[PDB]
Design a protein around this ligand. Structure first.
Ligand SMILES: CCNC(=O)c1n[nH]c(-c2cc(Cl)c(O)cc2O)c1-c1ccc(OC)cc1
Ligand SMILES: CCNC(=O)c1n[nH]c(-c2cc(Cl)c(O)cc2O)c1-c1ccc(OC)cc1
Lengths: 208, 208
């Protein structure tokens, strides 16, 4: 049912750098994950331009933000192109090995962690606030998978038989104990307004 | 030999807005075109991860900047994934119709033209400095095409029989008469250093 994989050495090193570096401006994770959602949404939209049946799995192109104080999770859902099993395994559709190398040569040259997205590995900023991350995804050319990691050098992939989602990607952030401010409506609103004001898809902040 | 197409109404409107709006910070075009080259390069690299024969048409992943004062052109070449004929026709692989709409709702809300790339239509900033633009491209799954436009509502596409390039995209900017500062080594260097310092591919500035 569940396969376990090792992160390539460079990705594991990126993940330790994000987890262990003292760095206070953690809120940029939300921008990186929304921006990722926007890229996936752009992709399904571009595909629908020549093949409208690509949208048979859902015409709505949007991003939802769902906080849950009881489970201590912030979930980001989008109706973008989604990922195949192979995409999930190859670093969630990123060029993360070379992107990590570039990012680290910048960090030497003075840059800081807020610029991680410029190197294509913005996802991993999720580990600034999350102790575990679960990625649930559905691409038109494959079944629904769940990817999951709590860092420490490994991730899992399983075929997800739970809630079918049609098409897209759901990112569930199991928040660190001292990071529950990102479940507060006021705070999420503030971050979205600050860093994500010109995203070309509706972003709905669910309430509790 | 040569097909002529009309820009969708919204793209034509974007192109008039870029050409006719008084706006002095024109140098951002280079950043947008390099960043486009970087995205294409990321794509061929991601593809090679699972199918290394994708790089049979060239293993080198780079961006060259070639000024020519005699022809009055700045050319940007990259060895990225390239575009099929259909990509060229569908707004150079962009979601330009919806991206233009978003960009224009931002311009109402106070944003300026330097943020065009946040809406996926950064290419068209080329018309801040160029009176004509020629895009020559080669994707693994198709032949070599040349796209061309001097705005005014139309572009052409032809199958390019001239210099074969293996794989990638070449953007040739026929500069406006008052915009020849972007052929000066000092100036191009300055712009690349300012706006394009963390691009994960070597950028070579050719000399004359
Ligand atoms: C290749 C076809 N699929 C995709 O590209 C895709 N599909 N879903 C996502 C995606 C990834 C993350 Cl991490 C996220 O938070 C949201 C997403 O939609 C992505 C995705 C993958 C890689 C990215 O690198 C910047 C950004 C988004
Ligand atoms: C779908 C497969 N091909 C590509 O995506 C592609 N190939 N070459 C380019 C490209 C486009 C421009 Cl305008 C440029 O200046 C440089 C490029 O490499 C692109 C490209 C297309 C769209 C883009 O939108 C941001 C950015 C780059």
């Amino acid at each position: 049912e569940v396969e376990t994989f090792a992160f390539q050495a460079e990705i594991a090193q990126l993940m330790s750098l994000i987890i262990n570096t003292f760095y206070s401006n953690k809120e940029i994770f939300l921008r990186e994950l929304i921006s990722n959602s926007s890229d996936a949404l752009d992709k399904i939209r571009y595909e629908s331009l020549t093949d409208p049946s690509k949208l048979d799995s859902g015409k709505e192109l949007h991003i939802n933000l769902i906080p849950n104080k009881q489970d201590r999770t912030l979930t980001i859902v989008d109706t973008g192109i989604g990922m195949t099993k192979a995409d999930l395994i190859n670093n969630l559709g990123t060029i993360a090995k070379s992107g990590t190398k570039a990012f680290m040569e910048a960090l030497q040259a003075g840059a800081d962690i807020s610029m991680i997205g410029q190197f294509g590995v913005g996802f991993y900023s999720a580990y600034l606030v999350a102790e575990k991350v679960t990625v649930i995804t559905k691409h038109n050319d494959d079944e629904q998978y769940a990817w999951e990691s709590s860092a420490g050098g490994s991730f899992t992939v399983r075929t997800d038989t739970g809630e079918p989602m049609g098409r897209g990607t759901k990112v569930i952030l199991h928040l660190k104990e001292d990071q529950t401010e990102y479940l507060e409506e006021r705070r999420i609103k503030e971050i979205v307004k600050k860093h994500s004001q010109f995203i070309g898809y509706p972003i709905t902040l669910f309430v509790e």
